[PDB]
Amino acid sequence: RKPPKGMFLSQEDVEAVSANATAATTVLRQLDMELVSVKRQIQNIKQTNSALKEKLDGGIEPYRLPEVIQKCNARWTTEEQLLAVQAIRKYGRDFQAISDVIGNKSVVQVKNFFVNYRRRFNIDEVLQEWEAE
Amino acid sequence: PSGVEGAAFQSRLPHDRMTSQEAACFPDIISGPQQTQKVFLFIRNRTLQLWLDNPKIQLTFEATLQQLEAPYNSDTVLVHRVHSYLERHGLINFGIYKRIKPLPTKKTGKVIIIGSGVSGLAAARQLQSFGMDVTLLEARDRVGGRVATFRKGNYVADLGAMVVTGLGGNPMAVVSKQVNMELAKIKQKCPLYEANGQAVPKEKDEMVEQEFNRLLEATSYLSHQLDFNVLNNKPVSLGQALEVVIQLQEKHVKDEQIEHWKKIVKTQEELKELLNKMVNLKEKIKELHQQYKEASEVKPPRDITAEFLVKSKHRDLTALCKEYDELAETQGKLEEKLQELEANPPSDVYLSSRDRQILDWHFANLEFANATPLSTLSLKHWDQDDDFEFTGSHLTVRNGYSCVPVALAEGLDIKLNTAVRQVRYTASGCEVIAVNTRSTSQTFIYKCDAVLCTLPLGVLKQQPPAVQFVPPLPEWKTSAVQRMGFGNLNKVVLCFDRVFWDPSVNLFGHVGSTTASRGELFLFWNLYKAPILLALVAGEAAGIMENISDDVIVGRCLAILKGIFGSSAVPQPKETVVSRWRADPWARGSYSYVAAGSSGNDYDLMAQPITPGPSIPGAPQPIPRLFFAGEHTIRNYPATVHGALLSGLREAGRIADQFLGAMYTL
Numbered sequence: 001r002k003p004p005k006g007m008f009l010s011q012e013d014v015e016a017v018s019a020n021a022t023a024a025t026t027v028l029r030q031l032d033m034e035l036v037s038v039k040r041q042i043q044n045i046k047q048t049n050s051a052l053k054e055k056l057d058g059g060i061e062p063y064r065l066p067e068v069i070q071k072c073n074a075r076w077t078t079e080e081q082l083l084a085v086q087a088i089r090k091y092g093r094d095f096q097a098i099s100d101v102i103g104n105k106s107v108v109q110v111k112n113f114f115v116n117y118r119r120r121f122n123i124d125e126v127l128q129e130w131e132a133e
Numbered sequence: 134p135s136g137v138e139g140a141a142f143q144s145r146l147p148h149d150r151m152t153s154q155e156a157a158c159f160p161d162i163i164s165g166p167q168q169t170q171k172v173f174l175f176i177r178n179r180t181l182q183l184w185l186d187n188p189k190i191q192l193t194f195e196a197t198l199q200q201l202e203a204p205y206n207s208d209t210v211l212v213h214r215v216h217s218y219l220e221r222h223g224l225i226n227f228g229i230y231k232r233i234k235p236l237p238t239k240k241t242g243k244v245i246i247i248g249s250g251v252s253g254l255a256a257a258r259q260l261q262s263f264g265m266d267v268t269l270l271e272a273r274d275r276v277g278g279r280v281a282t283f284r285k286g287n288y289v290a291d292l293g294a295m296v297v298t299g300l301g302g303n304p305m306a307v308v309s310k311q312v313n314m315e316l317a318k319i320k321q322k323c324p325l326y327e328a329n330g331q332a333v334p335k336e337k338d339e340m341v342e343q344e345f346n347r348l349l350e351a352t353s354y355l356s357h358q359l360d361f362n363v364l365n366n367k368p369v370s371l372g373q374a375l376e377v378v379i380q381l382q383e384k385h386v387k388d389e390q391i392e393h394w395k396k397i398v399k400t401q402e403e404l405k406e407l408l409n410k411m412v413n414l415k416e417k418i419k420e421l422h423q424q425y426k427e428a429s430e431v432k433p434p435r436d437i438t439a440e441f442l443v444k445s446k447h448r449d450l451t452a453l454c455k456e457y458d459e460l461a462e463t464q465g466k467l468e469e470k471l472q473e474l475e476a477n478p479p480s481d482v483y484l485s486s487r488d489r490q491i492l493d494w495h496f497a498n499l500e501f502a503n504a505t506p507l508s509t510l511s512l513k514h515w516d517q518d519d520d521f522e523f524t525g526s527h528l529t530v531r532n533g534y535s536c537v538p539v540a541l542a543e544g545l546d547i548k549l550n551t552a553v554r555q556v557r558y559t560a561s562g563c564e565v566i567a568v569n570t571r572s573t574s575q576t577f578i579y580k581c582d583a584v585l586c587t588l589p590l591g592v593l594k595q596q597p598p599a600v601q602f603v604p605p606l607p608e609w610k611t612s613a614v615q616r617m618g619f620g621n622l623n624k625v626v627l628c629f630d631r632v633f634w635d636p637s638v639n640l641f642g643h644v645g646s647t648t649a650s651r652g653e654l655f656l657f658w659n660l661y662k663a664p665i666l667l668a669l670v671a672g673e674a675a676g677i678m679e680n681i682s683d684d685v686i687v688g689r690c691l692a693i694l695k696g697i698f699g700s701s702a703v704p705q706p707k708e709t710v711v712s713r714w715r716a717d718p719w720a721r722g723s724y725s726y727v728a729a730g731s732s733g734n735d736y737d738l739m740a741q742p743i744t745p746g747p748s749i750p751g752a753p754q755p756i757p758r759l760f761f762a763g764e765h766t767i768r769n770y771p772a773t774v775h776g777a778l779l780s781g782l783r784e785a786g787r788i789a790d791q792f793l794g795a796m797y798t799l
């Protein structure tokens with residue numbers, strides 16, 4: 001029914017190795033080589049990759065900036081509102097970023113802000129200036 | 134199986150079915166009612182049993198009826214027909230029995246039998262008992278032909294056949310009861326020893342073997358499923374098939390390694406992408422921290438755009454650190470996932486140098502068994518005789534196989550030292566012209582009704598002809614003779630004054646160094662009472678080694694034997710013999726095989742008798758005159774003693790039918 005388990009033999013594969021006297025040792029060399037021709041290319045990329053690991057040397061440790069650990073808040077200070085308005089100019093609709101930047105405002109308060117002050121801060125205008133970049 | 138059905142089996146017959154040959158003797162029965170068929174069948178089996186249970190004395194129609202029971206011993210016309218059929222075709226009363234009904238008063242018809250092989254001998258005894266006048270012509274100064282047994286002092290070794298292949302349904306079983314044979318079983322434990330003389334270890338041994346068996350199965354698959362039987366006109370040999378299978382097993386081992394390492398680059402090529410995105414992150418991160426520091430200079434209280442800058446760069450920065458952290462996350466995983474792949478690769482090779490050398494010994498054993506290079510066997514057909522394998526374990530003839538021919542020979546008219554040279558067969562009869570092998574100009578002429586030819590196929594093959602047919606055999610016969618294969622296989626008999634091998638071990642193999650020499654002295658047999666070792670030359674070696682002198686051979690031998698058992702365990706041998714069957718003019722080989730481009734059907738062609746044309750034109754078509762028996766004429770049991778012996782039983786039947794008529798078929 002089927003070739004004794006393991007043993008490999010398929011219709012096309014067989015016509016391939018019998019086409020002439022040395023198709024035998026031809027298809028076996030084209031593969032012996034495709035092997036070295038990939039083993040080499042590994043050892044190459046291995047060295048390329050081992051250079052890059054030298055560049056990432058020591059990680060990014062000495063450039064981290066301590067955590068902005070700080071609680072939320074309900075009132076908008078004139079301070080906060082100005083920071084907000086600028087974040088919008090620079091971050092568009094990324095309410096997440098805007099939040100982090102202002103510091104003590106939740107990703108929601110932010111979107112709320114967007115509607116209440118939309119009127120007085122021409123937030124339409126601010127957004128379309130960000131869009132124009 | 135056993136009982137009355139035990140017999141039918143032990144007689145190579147189906148117990149619950151009528152054979153092709155019964156259908157012809159008994160067409161009335163088999164075309165008739167399912168009911169009588171069973172009566173026939175029972176009578177047959179019971180009669181066989183009767184014979185089998187006591188094959189040391191003749192079994193008569195008298196004694197048979199005697200021991201049957203009603204309802205079956207009612208129709209005595211039938212029981213007679215049956216006992217007669219079995220007697221004629223040699224299923225009962227064959228070999229060496231004690232005869233009850235004495236030998237016919239005057240004899241009828243005259244048969245000249247060529248060759249006193251086991252087949253000839255077997256035929257001769259049959260016809261003689263059937264009341265015919267028989268004479269055998271034998272070129273050699275002894276009987277048994279390809280059953281030769283070296284005898285000297287106490288040394289006894291066969292350079293001919295030496296194995297009996299299992300008593301389950303073998304006629305030799307019957308014979309071994311009739312004749313003094315010491316049958317001894319062959320313990321199939323066979324240690325191999327590498328070229329250097331170091332025993333190959335169980336780990337390898339068993340794993341190589343089963344690859345061999347797996348390789349054979351493989352070839353069978355190519356033949357029956359993938360229909361790989363002809364390669365641009367040339368028909369495929371088993372060797373061709375085996376190579377194509379091994380090639381494909383390499384081609385796979387490679388295909389593996391490729392898409393393994395090919396699966397590594399693809400990963401490295403990810404690690405590379407990562408590290409680039411990861412470097413250009415450090416770049417920006419480094420370059421931002423700078424700016425943040427600059428904008429942090431501007432000492433508070435700042436206006437808000439300057440505050441915004443500080444706050445904003447501090448996000449932008451930590452934001453990109455979150456990114457670079459996760460890329461260091463990935464980096465770590467990709468990097469264990471390469472210790473994964475680098476740790477377990479697939480297999481390095483299909484077979485090591487040392488493996489494909491042991492596998493060769495296995496291929497050697499297979500060549501030994503077919504007497505030929507695997508590159509000559511027919512793929513489709515080489516093992517057609519398979520389903521007829523006897524049960525029971527193989528044996529050897531401790532006191533030498535000749536004991537059998539010598540016993541069949543007893544009471545027969547045999548002319549030794551008589552080489553047949555021409556067979557003339559014409560409408561009114563045959564004449565056979567032999568010469569004396571000793572002084573060859575001295576001539577002999579034997580005239581007879583029929584000629585039974587047991588010339589080995591090697592002999593029938595010779596160019597120019599060693600025997601001449603007049604008129605020549607028809608092209609349908611001679612083509613069967615080209616087409617069939619006649620192999621070769623030699624023996625070396627080593628006679629020592631002491632055992633120095635493992636006494637309890639029957640055989641052990643030497644592993645040659647090359648494919649080309651895998652046949653050479655590859656296997657030794659411990660078989661006999663005296664200290665004799667027996668070594669085989671098989672396959673491509675067998676033929677080549679015939680052109681090398683005995684001394685050189687016995688040398689290469691002792692060497693191999695010292696290499697195993699230690700350089701001074703092994704004395705000079707007291708007596709040595711070296712067979713050369715291809716060179717032996719009355720054999721010209723060892724036994725047949727199914728050559729590529731043949732088929733078992735050629736064996737049937739080999740056996741069909743020849744019928745000479747008319748003398749006077751428009752005289753009626755005669756009787757057939759020339760008959761054939763022998764190892765090469767028995768489709769289902771070729772190349773064997775039992776198989777010859779049967780072919781001879783067969784012809785005696787067919788000859789009697791022709792010349793004494795067939796009473797039982799009415």
Ligand SMILES: [C]C1=C([C])[C]=C2C(=[C]1)N([C][C]([O])[C]([O])[C]([O])[C]OP([O])(=O)OP([O])(=O)O[C][C]1O[C](N3[C]=NC4=C3N=[C]N=C4[N])[C]([O])[C]1[O])C1=NC(=O)[N]C(=O)C1=N2C(=O)[C][C]C1=[C][C]=C(Br)[C]=[C]1
Nearest residue numbers: 248250251252272278279294295296553719723763764774
């Ligand atoms: C060779 C051989 C060896 C070495 C081994 C073996 C063998 C072989 N095998 C086989 C047998 O042996 C055979 O087959 C038989 O024997 C055969 O028989 P036949 O047919 O009968 O034939 P022969 O015998 O040959 O006879 C013939 C005769 O003839 C004569 N001639 C010729 N010519 C002439 C004459 N005459 C007159 N004139 C003229 N011209 C001659 O001389 C002769 O005699 C085997 N088998 C078995 O069974 N067993 C064994 O063991 C064997 N061996 C081995 O080892 C192996 C094989 C086998 C196979 C298969 C099987 Br299943 C088993 C085994």
